[PDB]
């Protein structure tokens, strides 16, 4: 997260870290046995780490659970990143409490102007590489579709939305992929892509979760 602030330990209880010997992506807990992340974060050997703040120190509250299966959306396109969503089923259910809790799925899509909270352990430099030890947060608004399409002509599909600042300076970045964009207590986005990080007129693009609720529900119901 570039230009963000330190969230505070366990203030984002639904945030998870996908780990394979190091942190490579973020995700969101939606019930005690399932997590939603980005399809481009897929790999084998994923351990889901819940209740984290400093990812390099065991401080207490952590729960390390292996993924039993990862379900990448069948129509995921890695060239355009259309349908960039993945569901992970945990080997055992997590113990939910105030530090580990699930986030709700939306019942309707969000409007331009909605202020949301984006979080993660990704890079904090637009020009460079600095990964933090603790979780970073950023409050950012959803932009209008015209501004988004004008910034990335020909690359935005109806399953994506832009959020951020056109002046640059504040944005999500590599390492934040798969993490949550929460607005009014509902999970509306998943960190997907962008041109560099925090560049002027190049906001972050996110997977539009409201378009996938029936799919998530049906898939969880059959697995
Ligand atoms: N500018 C951005 N919001 C992002 C830039 C990236 C990059 I560079 C890699 C992976 C994910 C993201 S999100
Ligand atoms: Ca830790
Ligand atoms: Cl267009």
Swiss-Prot record:
Subsequent cleavage after Lys-125 leads to alpha-trypsin. Further cleavage after Lys-170 yields pseudotrypsin. A cleavage may also occur after Arg-99. Not sulfated on tyrosine residue(s). It is an enzyme of class 3 (hydrolase). InterPro entries: Peptidase_S1_PA, Peptidase_S1_PA_chymotrypsin, Peptidase_S1A, Serine_Proteases_S1, Trypsin_dom, TRYPSIN_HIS, TRYPSIN_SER. Residues 1-221 form the Peptidase S1 domain. The keyword Protease applies. The active site is at 40 (charge relay system), 84 (charge relay system), 177 (charge relay system). Synthesized in the acinar cells of the pancreas. Is inhibited by scorpion cyclotide trypsin inhibitor TopI1. Keywords: Calcium, Digestion, Disulfide bond, Hydrolase, Metal-binding, Protease, Secreted, Serine protease, Signal, Zymogen. Gene3D superfamilies: Trypsin-like serine proteases. It comes from the Eukaryota. It is found in: Secreted, Extracellular space. GO terms for molecular function: endopeptidase activity; metal ion binding; serine-type endopeptidase activity; serpin family protein binding. Its cofactor is Ca(2+). GO terms for cellular component: extracellular space; serine protease inhibitor complex. Binds 1 Ca(2+) ion per subunit. Pfam families: Trypsin. GO terms for biological process: digestion; proteolysis. Its EC number is 3.4.21.4. Interacts with SERPINA1. This is Serine protease 1. It comes from Bos taurus. The gene is PRSS1.
């Amino acid at each position: 997260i570039v230009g963000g602030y330190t969230c505070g330990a366990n203030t984002v209880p639904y945030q998870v870290s996908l780990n394979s010997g190091y942190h490579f992506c973020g995700g969101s807990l939606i019930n005690s046995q399932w997590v939603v992340s980005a399809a481009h974060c897929y790999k084998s050997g994923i351990q889901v780490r819940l209740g984290e703040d400093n990812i390099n120190v065991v401080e207490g509250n952590e729960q390390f659970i292996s993924a039993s299966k990862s379900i990448v959306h069948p129509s995921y396109n890695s060239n355009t990143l259309n349908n960039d969503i993945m569901l992970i089923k945990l080997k055992s259910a997590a113990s939910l409490n105030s530090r580990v809790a699930s986030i709700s799925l939306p019942t309707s899509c969000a409007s331009a102007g909605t202020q949301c909270l984006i979080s993660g352990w990704g890079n904090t430099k637009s020009s460079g590489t600095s990964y933090p030890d603790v979780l970073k947060c950023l409050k950012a608004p959803i932009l209008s579709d015209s501004s988004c399409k004008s910034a990335y002509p020909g690359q935005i599909t109806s399953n994506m939305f832009c959020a951020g600042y056109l002046e640059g300076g504040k944005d999500s970045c590599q390492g934040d992929s798969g993490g949550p964009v929460v607005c009014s207590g509902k999970l509306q986005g998943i960190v997907s892509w962008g041109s560099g990080c925090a560049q002027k007129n190049k906001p972050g693009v996110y997977t539009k979760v409201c378009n996938y609720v029936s799919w998530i529900k049906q898939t969880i119901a059959s697995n």
